[PDB]
Amino acid sequence: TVPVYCVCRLPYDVTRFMIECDACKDWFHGSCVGVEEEEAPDIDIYHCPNCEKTHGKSTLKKKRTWHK
């Protein structure tokens, strides 16, 4: 056996974006849990779908300008 990850329990494939849940510290493919790689810089706290129930929804944090 080898290290496996995510809800799909697969070995690490370097061609796939992955994100680590801040609550359980496990790794998930963005495509398996609905997170796109381009969205990750805006995530302040990521909770996977399981951990959302015990720890609450993920939090986004980003900068914004409004007048222009």
Partner: peptide
């Protein structure tokens, strides 16, 4: 969060 970027 920690991430692993998609590679080629």
């Amino acid at each position: 969060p920690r991430v692993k970027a998609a590679q080629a």
